[PDB]
Amino acid sequence: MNPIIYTTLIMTVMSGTMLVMISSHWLLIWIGFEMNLLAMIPVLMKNFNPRATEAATKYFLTQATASMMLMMAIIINLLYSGQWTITKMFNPVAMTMMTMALAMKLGLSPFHFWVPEVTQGISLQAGLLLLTWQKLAPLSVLCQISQSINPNLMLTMAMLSILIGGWGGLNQTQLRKIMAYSSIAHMGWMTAVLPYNTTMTILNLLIYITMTLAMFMLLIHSSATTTLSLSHTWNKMPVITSLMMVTLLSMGGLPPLSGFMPKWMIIQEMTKNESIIMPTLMAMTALLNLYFYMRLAYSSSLTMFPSTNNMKMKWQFEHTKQMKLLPTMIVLSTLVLPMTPALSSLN
Amino acid sequence: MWFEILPGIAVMAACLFIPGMATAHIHKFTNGGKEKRVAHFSYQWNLMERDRRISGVNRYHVTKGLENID
Amino acid sequence: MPLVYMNIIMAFAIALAGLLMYRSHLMSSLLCLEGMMLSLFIMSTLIILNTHFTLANMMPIILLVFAACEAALGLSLLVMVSNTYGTDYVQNLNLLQC
Amino acid sequence: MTMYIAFILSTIFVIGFVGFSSKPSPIYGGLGLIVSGGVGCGIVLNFGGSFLGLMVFLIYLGGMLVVFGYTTAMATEMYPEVWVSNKTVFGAFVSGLMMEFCMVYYALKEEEVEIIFKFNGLGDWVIYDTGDSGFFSEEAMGIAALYSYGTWLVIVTGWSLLIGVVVIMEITRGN
């Protein structure tokens, strides 16, 4: 792809997201979603191969079905009230259809099936974009209509997302599928607290985005997409594996690391609403994500795997391209728990 | 050819005359002989319906002048 | 609501079921997607005409526009799929697992 | 009540939708979508929207022509399927026809809430507005307002169409 065309497509994806997040009219939100998808499809196929084509086709089918459902919900809401403003859905059937469409766009269970496959089929940069930037628009729409959502359906989908993310991640040797299942579990955590407090949803989104950016940048730096490929990194860049191990511990939510702060803030919030069973189950299930993060850390940094002879040649060369925001991303992914009260600036 | 093509053209022209003249004559025959009313907008349709109501014989083209207001 | 509104909503539901229930050809699914767009156009047009909301007389047209984009997008993808396999069968899209 | 022309047109709309959603060969699915587009144009025209119905019919005629070409290129097989050449296709077609019949019966003979709300019938003509004024068409005025009120819509639509050209150029590049 031409670099100018690539920049235009990236800016069109971003413009679709901004259109979604600045619009007060349902039609403009729908248009933002369409523009985002249209510009997003070629970015997934930037490195042409059969796997990228299959991933793009699956992604487009999922998102186009979700867009059809979303427009149907908009039209039903308009039918039962001549309203185009995104405030609060006036028809419960329209609200259910809108919630399902947004869950399908986000990849929440049971509409999670496409998230691993697509993430496996594209490059690491495309996966970074797909797992960080593509969540902003549906989550913003969900935040705007939070009072209208039926708590039972949303909480069922959130609990299913956490459970399925943990269980699916337990079985993976490929790093992109691991990141996808991690993403599904984190999305469940985000959508669980949405009916109670949208500021907690935003805080969780920011923290997850920071840690996901750190991990994808570390995986691009050590160009590894499998566990065994990542097991060679200690013999070329030990600092990278150490930083990856600390970031993995943070993603598992262990204190005093940053990844603990969202869950801690969510469970607590839920207890203000007389919700104890769901937070208890949520934490006990996030233990599974911690388990497969720990397994990756075992294979990558805490032990030393056998290497190859040709690695000696790689000892003689440095990394040509430097990532400016990787150090800030790692520090933000690990050492921000003492600044927890700053979350008040998010409301 | 050359003027032996002309009879075919004459037959074609005679056939093509019939639609327009027939439409004009049928419009005059079914509209009191005065060029069937055109209703492109609802105001013209309202005028036609009012004419039909005030005709007394349920026909808009029946026109009432100053002799109908005693 | 009138029988026509429920008929249009039923048409949308039928097209969505057709999309969700796959057969071999991807083109058939693309046709189901276009049918969903058509039903949405008809329903929104009927509502906007019935309520005499003048300024949304333009939104179905814009709707149509983005429909075209989807169609174009889908057709593009189909071409690539065919160029890989010689068929547009959805069975061939099984390189990626869960 | 009033000749139920619109009800017949909507029923044919549903029938064509079932025709293409049972998914025979895309030749017949395209034909079914063309029939649905025509009857939908008729439905919209019966409610005063001449421009919208005609334009959606024209757009879908063009789209189905492109789909026919693409079907001949990439969606053919030795024996293309019709609605009676396959047990699955025939079953889907008959099931759709019968469940349409069930909805119509249960809606017109008694009043029930199918999924969202209820219906009694009374024909479409009841919900009309009987407004009497104007040397113009309100639909045409609302559509033409796109160039004075809908500047933002024009901007985003034109950008999306240009980007769509670039996108289809990128996707089919290969390499």
Place this chain on the structure above:
Amino acid sequence: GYSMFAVGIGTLLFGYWSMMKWNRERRRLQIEDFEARIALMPLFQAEKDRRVLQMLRENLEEEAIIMKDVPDWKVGESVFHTTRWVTPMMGELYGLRTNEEILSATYGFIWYT
């Protein structure tokens, strides 16, 4: 080469001038018949008000006759909380009338060609 283009542009300018004059005249004539409509509008408004009111009154009297046996039915009871005038739905005006004039009031303008 030069002569052909010169004749073409000359013809185009002559046509533009002629059509400019004719279209300005057409705009003036349209303003004139719009003014005729504006002058006629109040009479049509008065007659339409009387016609709608009479149809509603006849429906009210017939409904009073018909619904005298039903126990808990209020004659002429509104369905709106507000007491201001609501423009009658055409179904209410022609509810108790024959099919042909209902087809008229519904589809006469659309079907007129």
Place this chain on the structure above:
Amino acid sequence: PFFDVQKRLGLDLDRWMTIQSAEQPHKIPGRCHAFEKEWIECAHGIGGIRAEKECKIEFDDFVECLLRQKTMKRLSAIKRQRDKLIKEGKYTPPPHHLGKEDPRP
């Protein structure tokens, strides 16, 4: 989530199209202009939670204008009673509801 750029800049990107009572071309009114105007003026500035309870009358009238469900039910009841009466012959429709009226302009 919602970065409210329009009100900050006074841009009006899409607010002209959100409601039925907002500045139509050639001053063409919506079918339910008065009801929506009343409901909007009732609910302005008091918040959604309070508006759902304290403007229920205006919103119900607006919805009745939009869908006309109560009107259709009432017309159906009147028609059913008329049909029941006519079948037994107790009630006879008048000439002006059978096509024999004296029309007026």
Place this chain on the structure above:
Amino acid sequence: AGRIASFLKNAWAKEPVLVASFAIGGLAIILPSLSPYTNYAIRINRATPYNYPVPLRDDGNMPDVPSHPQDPQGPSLEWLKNL
């Protein structure tokens, strides 16, 4: 100065259709901003009375509002007749 002249000569020799298209499109873009009759078109559009002119209630403080259509006050379409 001379480079653009040579480019135009080459384009006129090889692709006259594109040259004509670009010239016509450029004129269509630029000429309306320099025309004195655009404002006349706007005024003609605003002079078309699609809907009824609703009268204003007299409050005794309306010197510029006519009491009758033929009264001298109000807008005048004299400029339109002579056009």
Place this chain on the structure above:
Amino acid sequence: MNIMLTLLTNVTLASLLVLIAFWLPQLNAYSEKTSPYECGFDPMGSARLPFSMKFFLVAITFLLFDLEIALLLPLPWASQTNNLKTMLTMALFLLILLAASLAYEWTQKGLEWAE
């Protein structure tokens, strides 16, 4: 109502013409007579086999350009608005991007048929 009657009349006339064509003449149909025509000989393959399209990119581009027709047909009514300066800017802007998209496809060899 008149248009429906017109459509019914035209379709009925064509259908009766087909009926007359199939029921008036003497029919002598045999397998050799009804076999596929390929100028003297039996076809090698099936006519239902895939037939490659060399103008596939232009066909997709036609879909996007056909909806530009939808956006420009309300132009005669748009010329009647009071703020002509805004509509002319938006009408010209929409035609400029259509010209730019055609220019982009033309320069990137998109209008050339596949070899």
Place this chain on the structure above:
Amino acid sequence: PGIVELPTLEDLKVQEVKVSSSVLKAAAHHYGAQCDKPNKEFMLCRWEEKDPRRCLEEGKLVNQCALDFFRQIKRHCAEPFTEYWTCIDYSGLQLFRHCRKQQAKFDECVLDKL
């Protein structure tokens, strides 16, 4: 919700203007010139009260003024007006521009006599 109050059939009665639309179009300019005051009063009532039941007497005055206008025309010269509106009535779109001679005669008559 309350009972909708409707006028009786007796007070909805008025002397109707029973001339066709072509006659009205032919007379419209002078009609809007002469009968301006009651028409404007009625239309002000109409857009202020937003209720047809509250502007019935003004509508009756509109009818009465229109009837007086047409009676005066019938009294002074009916033949020029009759030819004018017949010419107007022939047109399917009822065009003013196709009947300028008859319009000129009618205008000269109403100017000289009235």
Place this chain on the structure above:
Amino acid sequence: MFMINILSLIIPILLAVAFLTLVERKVLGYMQLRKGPNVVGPYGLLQPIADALKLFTKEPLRPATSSISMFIIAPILALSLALTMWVPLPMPYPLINMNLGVLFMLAMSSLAVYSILWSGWASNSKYALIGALRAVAQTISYEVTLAIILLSVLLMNGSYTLSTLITTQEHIWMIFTSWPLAMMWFISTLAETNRAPFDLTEGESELVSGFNVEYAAGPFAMFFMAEYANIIMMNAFTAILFLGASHDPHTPELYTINFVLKTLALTITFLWIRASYPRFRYDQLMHLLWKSFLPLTLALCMWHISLPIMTASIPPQS
């Protein structure tokens, strides 16, 4: 009385098509230094009747590999649409008066292509398939340019009502204001009616008979009746658009005669063009329509949008 009008429209159109076959044969003959049909009837006046009687008494064959339903539906669709195209045309009064008559013509013309597509596909023969795919390519070539040309031309009419075109051209033919557009419009009609040099879906010298190679007898005759009716209809539409005949409301026969003469001139011009030029290649038609006609059409659309505003000459009737 409306059915009488339907008949008085459709039957004379069929007779005009029948005798247009003779007129084209004789015109090509005399342009080829021969006479053409002059034996079957005086000056060949009975040749169309003999051709029709021969075709409708000949055996129609149903191909073994064909799909019978579309095979029968396609000629019916072709002929019925060809007849339907005539109902909004004002001569000077239309049978059906529409606000958007131009859009109705566009939509029905776009639908008529499916007759050729479905006949070619349901024939289940290779040459018919090649003809159908050429029809796909031809529509892709001409549709956008034809629509934009029509919009640019109608910007001076003020609406899509066909009868208004009579009022627009009361003092000057519209071809004097838009002769470039008319030029392309004419060529576009040649491509739209599948006429030489753009008779690619037929292509006698390339694909024996193209899409209708498997058709015989009555349905075959129906396809030609549809094609020739479309030729006459498109030329009449062009005459209405660009050669405005003065109409007198009290003597409409003068308008009818003038209109018929102009339509005959345009049809004879089509026959002349067929006699004069070789056939295009079907990719060359696409390149002609997309690289020459489309840019000029876009520029002229811009110009015809700006011109009424620049000169304060916007037409009435929003």
